[PDB]
Ligand binder design. Structure first.
Ligand SMILES: Nc1nccc(C(F)(F)F)n1
Ligand SMILES: Nc1nccc(C(F)(F)F)n1
Ligand SMILES: [Cl-]
Ligand SMILES: [Mg+2]
Ligand SMILES: [Mg+2]
Ligand SMILES: [Mg+2]
Ligand SMILES: [Mg+2]
Lengths: 194, 195
């Protein structure tokens, strides 16, 4: 019923552009929208990956491995699933295992890979694959994991028990000025609601 | 240890602006970022709310109520939690019950309310409150739900059983060429991962 008529570039930076979107509404009336897109999206099924990294260890509760980083858009520290953009020609699964190792030091095993899902579809066309990865924390490879951050990457690893994730996030938010990512919080809420 | 030095306006629309953010990296090196902000936020706790609506009917599976809408930035239809921007002087809780009624016609009760959570913090400063709302589907006011959508809103309601949410969302994507919202998919995943 509804479809795009035109996409007019307003402003294009190195990383992000703003567009004037013209579309047909279901009454048959022309309307416009302000649309954000990234400049980095090539022939990928999505902009990026976020990794749901389930750290498994004999005689430990499963942990969810999270990262804390300064996010210039937010003007502050954010707690998020390990995540990055998919390199040209890179599979979502390879991107997920690569970003997880670079940001946390852990070497994961793929469990599942979502279709492309939308980050903020009233604002942007940005998409990710959410890749579930298990980490064998009994493997020597995953003993003393050292992050290998790229240039301008400054990442702290926070591993929280799956069985108490929402309360543990709440206790981190109570103790410091930091924002939890909406996907992490949605995931922690569902663990509670299950 | 890191902080904003300055923000340079690049482009300001009616709804969205693009800024060049200058920040101090942990080493003392000065760095720039391209940052998106909405123009609509004021004294608000957050830009918006997203409602997790648990529809509870006796002798029925518990359902999560979702909405399907054309999303101009996506150039397509998306499946999402009911959601909208918070009105100036509106509480996140009141925004949640209002948006849920306008988008779905259901009248629900606040179960819990998240702190402000970020939407895409590598790109934008956009935040929402995630508001868990229960709907007593057996009440008369939720018998024939009357959606009251504002100007230029066109919303299909899709109720999916909570206990099979992820498999049900995967099926919609396979038949219907839709995009599932990342928060919806994250919730559905954790329902399967809990056990
Ligand atoms: N980004 C954007 N563009 C046009 C209209 C809107 C509004 F839904 F919030 F009104 N947002
Ligand atoms: N929005 C934005 N600004 C600067 C650099 C980036 C990058 F992560 F994609 F590299 N993004
Ligand atoms: Cl609930
Ligand atoms: Mg990253
Ligand atoms: Mg990275
Ligand atoms: Mg609305
Ligand atoms: Mg809405």
């Amino acid at each position: 019923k509804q479809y795009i008529i035109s996409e007019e570039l307003i402003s294009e930076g190195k990383w992000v552009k703003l567009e004037k979107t013209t579309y047909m509404d279901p009454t048959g009336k022309t309307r416009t929208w302000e649309s954000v897109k990234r400049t980095t999206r090539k022939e990928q099924t999505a902009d990026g990956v976020a990794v749901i990294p389930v750290l498994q260890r004999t005689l430990h509760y499963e942990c969810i491995v999270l990262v804390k980083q300064f996010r210039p858009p937010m003007g502050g520290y954010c707690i998020e699933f390990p995540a990055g953009l998919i390199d040209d020609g890179e599979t979502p699964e390879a991107a997920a295992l690569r970003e997880l190792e670079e940001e946390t030091g852990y070497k994961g095993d793929i469990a599942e890979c979502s279709p492309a899902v939308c980050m903020d579809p009233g604002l942007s066309n940005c998409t990710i694959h959410i890749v579930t990865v298990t980490i064998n924390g009994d493997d020597a490879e995953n003993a003393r994991p050292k992050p290998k951050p790229g240039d301008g990457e400054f990442v702290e690893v926070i591993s929280l028990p799956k069985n108490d994730l929402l309360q543990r996030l709440d206790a981190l938010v109570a103790e410091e000025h930091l924002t939890v990512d909406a996907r992490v919080y949605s995931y922690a809420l569902a663990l509670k609601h299950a």
